[PDB]
Amino acid sequence: GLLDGKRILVSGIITDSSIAFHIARVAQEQGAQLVLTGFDRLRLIQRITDRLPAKAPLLELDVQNEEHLASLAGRVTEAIGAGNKLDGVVHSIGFMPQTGMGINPFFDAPYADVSKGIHISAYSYASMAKALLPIMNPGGSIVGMGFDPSRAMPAYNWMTVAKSALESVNRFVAREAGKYGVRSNLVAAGPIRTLAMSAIVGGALGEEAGAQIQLLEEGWDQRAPIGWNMKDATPVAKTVCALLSDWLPATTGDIIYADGGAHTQLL
Amino acid sequence: GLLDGKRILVSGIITDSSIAFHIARVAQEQGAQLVLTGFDRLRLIQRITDRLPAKAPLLELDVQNEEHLASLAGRVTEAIGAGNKLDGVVHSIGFMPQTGMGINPFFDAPYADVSKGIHISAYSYASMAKALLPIMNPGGSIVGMGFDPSRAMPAYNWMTVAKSALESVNRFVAREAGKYGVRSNLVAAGPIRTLAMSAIVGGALGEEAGAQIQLLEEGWDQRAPIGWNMKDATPVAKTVCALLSDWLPATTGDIIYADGGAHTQLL
Amino acid sequence: GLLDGKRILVSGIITDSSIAFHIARVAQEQGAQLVLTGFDRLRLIQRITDRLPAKAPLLELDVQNEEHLASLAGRVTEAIGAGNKLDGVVHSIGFMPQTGMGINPFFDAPYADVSKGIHISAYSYASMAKALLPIMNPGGSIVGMGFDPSRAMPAYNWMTVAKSALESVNRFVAREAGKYGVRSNLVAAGPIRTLAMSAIVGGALGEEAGAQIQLLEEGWDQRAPIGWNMKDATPVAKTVCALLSDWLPATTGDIIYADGGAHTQLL
Amino acid sequence: GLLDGKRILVSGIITDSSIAFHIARVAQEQGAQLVLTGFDRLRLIQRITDRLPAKAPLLELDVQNEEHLASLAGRVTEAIGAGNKLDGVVHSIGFMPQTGMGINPFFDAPYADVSKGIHISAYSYASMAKALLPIMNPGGSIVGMGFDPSRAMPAYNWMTVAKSALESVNRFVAREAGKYGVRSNLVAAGPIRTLAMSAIVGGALGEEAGAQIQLLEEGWDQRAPIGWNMKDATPVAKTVCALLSDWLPATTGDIIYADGGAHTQLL
Ligand SMILES: NC(=O)C1=CN([C@@H]2O[C@H](COP(=O)(O)OP(=O)(O)OC[C@H]3O[C@@H](n4cnc5c(N)ncnc54)[C@H](O)[C@@H]3O)[C@@H](O)[C@H]2O)C=CC1
Ligand SMILES: NC(=O)C1=CN([C@@H]2O[C@H](COP(=O)(O)OP(=O)(O)OC[C@H]3O[C@@H](n4cnc5c(N)ncnc54)[C@H](O)[C@@H]3O)[C@@H](O)[C@H]2O)C=CC1
Ligand SMILES: NC(=O)C1=CN([C@@H]2O[C@H](COP(=O)(O)OP(=O)(O)OC[C@H]3O[C@@H](n4cnc5c(N)ncnc54)[C@H](O)[C@@H]3O)[C@@H](O)[C@H]2O)C=CC1
Ligand SMILES: NC(=O)C1=CN([C@@H]2O[C@H](COP(=O)(O)OP(=O)(O)OC[C@H]3O[C@@H](n4cnc5c(N)ncnc54)[C@H](O)[C@@H]3O)[C@@H](O)[C@H]2O)C=CC1
């Protein structure tokens, strides 16, 4: 069991096709005891998570809520029992109001909307770390979910800016986390057919967005020297588990690309 | 005259040691007619700018003000006369509340403070572009001021996150600006002894910040194969002018490092 | 056992402080059956490898020898028995004549000497892949050893050029290897006290080299948010094993930094 | 005149569609006195260069010839007159035997052929610098021609490896050149329809190469936010001249992308 004995907080389960859902599953299959957090439809999330191969306490956490962040460590040690600490934290949380993604022209997202997306998608990586490093073991691992934002791309727009900010935050959380003996890294994932992703290629945010995203994903699989299957989140899940394991013990402030190799190839 | 005939909006003059101040000066020495914008002490800025080798209208612009952004193009064509357009825009604007720079631990900047810095230092690059591309000529150039945020560094903290977001914004403004025949680029500058920079090495934001920044700059000059003189902004000024010229006509969404070569060298 | 059942060719064992030595050891501790290759002192290597926690056939391979490359696949399937294939190949081979490292000024390495180092240290990664992909399983993994060559550094000189070429070769072997269902990646390691490394800080290649390398390594541990211990190769060993495992199944043409996080940090 | 008064050695003119040809032309139009070097058809090159807007001495230089390198500085000061030095050197030289480009599979280039291409296309950048820095002024500029080798691409194959090595060499020549007050940089150009380029899209090196290159170039113009015209070398020429000028005085060991902005954009 890659993750035998480890206690791991996995955030961001919203449906059974969330990337966190699969991380959660592969983690349990691998020996880990989890605690889960969820955003706003908690009953829905409870019903979804009932399907993991094992039970796991579930706590509410709205990353924009000071008080939830304040109480989080208490709620976690309670759920895992006093005298116990986390070995692993997964941040798999993201959001950008739709005015910052694809419908709208890039220049028409208003600041209050982008600030919200940066808050939830980038800054919150620091918040979770701050809230949780006090309850983590030496040898621990924080892992966040990004996508390669180093070139601009159609439709993703401000969400790419948010991911750029996230990569930079991650390099700073690594500085803090290191004082605890704790690694911090991002997994840069290829596009994965989430419920929201599907809704977008179905045109949820306008037709030209839809067509652009669709063209983006097909290009991925073509460049990926080992292919990319957007229908299958589990190679990303496995990658996160590798970073939660003790098998990358000298990597931090870093980015692991689970993307089929697509970013290393031009045509 | 590198810039003969060009009309250029240069933002961000606050003292005679602002980097915009020198860009302004080198630009005039080079043939350009400028319009200047300033933030909040306009009388102060007027008195400062009186010293440039030529007169230049001065307009108020608070990058967080919708109405200033709204009116900006009107105020500019008025100042340069109807039927005239800009060839050049300089964004040399930045700010991060001090809770996000160095005193404070990284995890204690509150979101409202970082959001403010991201607003002024990153998002505003899109705002200026949006406000001004309607009044720019084919062959034009937007240039913003950054610093290399690809590795974390002590004290700069959230300001580095903000610069990471800026680089990503710049790649998107390039997409928009290209429809107008207009380039967008950043100059990544080495550390330069601005009034605020000095105040910080003098300990304005705590002693350990001060010492860290001071150590940062000395490392710069040591790595720079051609040296780096933080007392002298004019090699950065000249670099911005090169991007305003027609001599980099195939570069955009890009980053030019005016940093003595320091980023290309490890020890 | 991370590597249970896998058959793995590990090249480059020359002493018990070679990085391959530890990869070999951690791999065996982890379930793998190995075949080993060695360069020129085969009796010496046999005596060294006798110390691994398990036996492993040992084959001669001089990466500059056409005939050794020609025969290699035969010799390997013989050693592992017909009808069996490799799951894993480790390239941990490197060399640059000393005229290209540190004594000599950079401009005085003669081409014939640099060509030799590029041959052994970069091109040979393609050669091993070519010689061995015919005997590898879907799901396999080729892993080479590099160091981050993206900034120039004192003394390493042409060896850095060679590592730059290696990273680029690796992106091409990924293209080929993918047709076999096989990943190709590099581990970028922090400096590790090998016999040759020690000899150099002891001044083997001149005093100023020695002092520069020594300054390089101390800077590493200072930047590394989780520290770097050049005396201990085993975090690199573990990283290579992670890439040999099935836990990074969507990464290829890529670079994993086992370097304590040092490359993500400026000061 | 951007380059008024400067003396500049421009290498690599072979036809009137060579990139050096246009650099040469734009440089003269801009005030510079040139000395030119040529590889092996000197009479041909003389007849070609007769067309520049001004005369320029022409010297033979085969970058693989020790004796030509040995004598080069003598021949140059002779041609420019004793007591005079160079302000500018252009390296616009490249070659990879066709076994390393596109016909052949990547694994079938033999080392002796790749070594040749690395010799001419990468190592020679150090050679020219070594041969010429002794006859350069403070404030001088060495400029080489590359293409972005950071992702693998079809057909270019070993020539991409060679360009990877070149970028790394350039970071080392910057270290040496800095002791003379001299900058070293590369221009990364978009694809440009040279005679050899045309021959290749015409299938000179096999049909699938041809089709791949052709697909590569069309993708360039599509990503380039300001377009890319492979028929027109003069935006690259202008970029090189910008680096020869005094307008990028703090950039070295660096890479300027004259590529329409294509590398900053994913789809
Ligand atoms: N699906 C894709 O193609 C890729 C997604 N990613 C990233 O993976 C992560 C997970 O998203 P997916 O699983 O793809 O979609 P998802 O929609 O299943 O996950 C988004 C999670 O963010 C949570 N969330 C939103 N606002 C929140 C708040 N205020 N507090 C707490 N949680 C909040 C949602 O509840 C949801 O569980 C995101 O960072 C996404 O950007 C990275 C690469 C690719
Ligand atoms: N000084 C340094 O070592 C380096 C500075 N930079 C960047 O150069 C740019 C200029 O800063 P410096 O000249 O160094 O300092 P400075 O303090 O002279 O310039 C800052 C400018 O931002 C303006 N500003 C702040 N808030 C504003 C708002 N709401 N609206 C409009 N303007 C506002 C200020 O009025 C000031 O003119 C900034 O982007 C800075 O981050 C980049 C590299 C190095
Ligand atoms: N030690 C260090 O600080 C770092 C080393 N690396 C790389 O790790 C790899 C292994 O080197 P170390 O274990 O450090 O030193 P080492 O000297 O123990 O390993 C070098 C291996 O290359 C082999 N070799 C040399 N010429 C050969 C040829 N013609 N054919 C076959 N093999 C040949 C040697 O026999 C030796 O086994 C090299 O790629 C090195 O550049 C990467 C990062 C750091
Ligand atoms: N054409 C393209 O799409 C791009 C070309 N480049 C680079 O621009 C540079 C110039 O090539 P182009 O003008 O495109 O082609 P070209 O064929 O006109 O120039 C090649 C030059 O290399 C010279 N050369 C070859 N072997 C030599 C030797 N032993 N000694 C001295 N010179 C030798 C040739 O004589 C020729 O003048 C090369 O570095 C090329 O890789 C960079 C980006 C794009």
Residue numbers in the entry:
A (entry chain A), B (entry chain A), C (entry chain A), D (entry chain A): 3 to 269
Direct quotes from the study:
InhA (also known as FabI) is an essential component of the type II fatty acid synthase system (FasII) involved in fatty acid elongation and is required for mycolate production in M. tuberculosis. The FasII system is highly conserved in bacteria but absent from humans making it an attractive drug target. InhA is already the target of the current frontline anti-tuberculosis agent isoniazid. The combined results unambiguously indicate that pyridomycin is a competitive inhibitor of the NADH-binding site of InhA, NADH-dependent enoyl-[Acyl-Carrier-Protein] reductase, the target of the two anti-tuberculosis pro-drugs isoniazid and ethionamide.
The only non-synonymous mutation found was an a443g transition in inhA resulting in replacement of the aspartic acid at position 148 by a glycine (D148G). With reference to previously published structures of the NADH-dependent enoyl-ACP reductase InhA, Asp148 was found to be located near the NADH binding pocket. Surprisingly, we found that the Km of InhA (D148G) for NADH was 14-fold greater than for wild-type InhA suggesting a lower affinity for NADH in the D148G mutant. InhA (D148G) could not be inhibited at all by pyridomycin at concentrations below 18.6 µM. To determine the molecular basis for this resistance, we crystallized InhA (D148G) in the presence or absence of NADH. As with InhA and InhA (S94A), we obtained crystals only in presence of NADH and solved the InhA (D148G):NADH structure to 2.54 Å. By comparing the structure of InhA (D148G):NADH with that of wild-type InhA:NADH and InhA (S94A):NADH obtained in this study and elsewhere, we observed only one major effect, namely rotation of the phenylalanine 149 (Phe149) side chain by 90°. Otherwise, the positions of other active site residues as well as the overall structure of the protein were identical. Furthermore, rotation of the Phe149 side chain in the InhA (D148G) mutant also results in opening of a water channel allowing the addition of two water molecules in the active site as well as increasing the distance between the nicotinamide ring of NADH and the ring of Phe149, leading to a decrease in NADH affinity as confirmed by kinetic studies. The same structural changes most probably also explain the decreased sensitivity of InhA (D148G) to pyridomycin compared to wild-type as NADH and pyridomycin share a similar binding pocket.
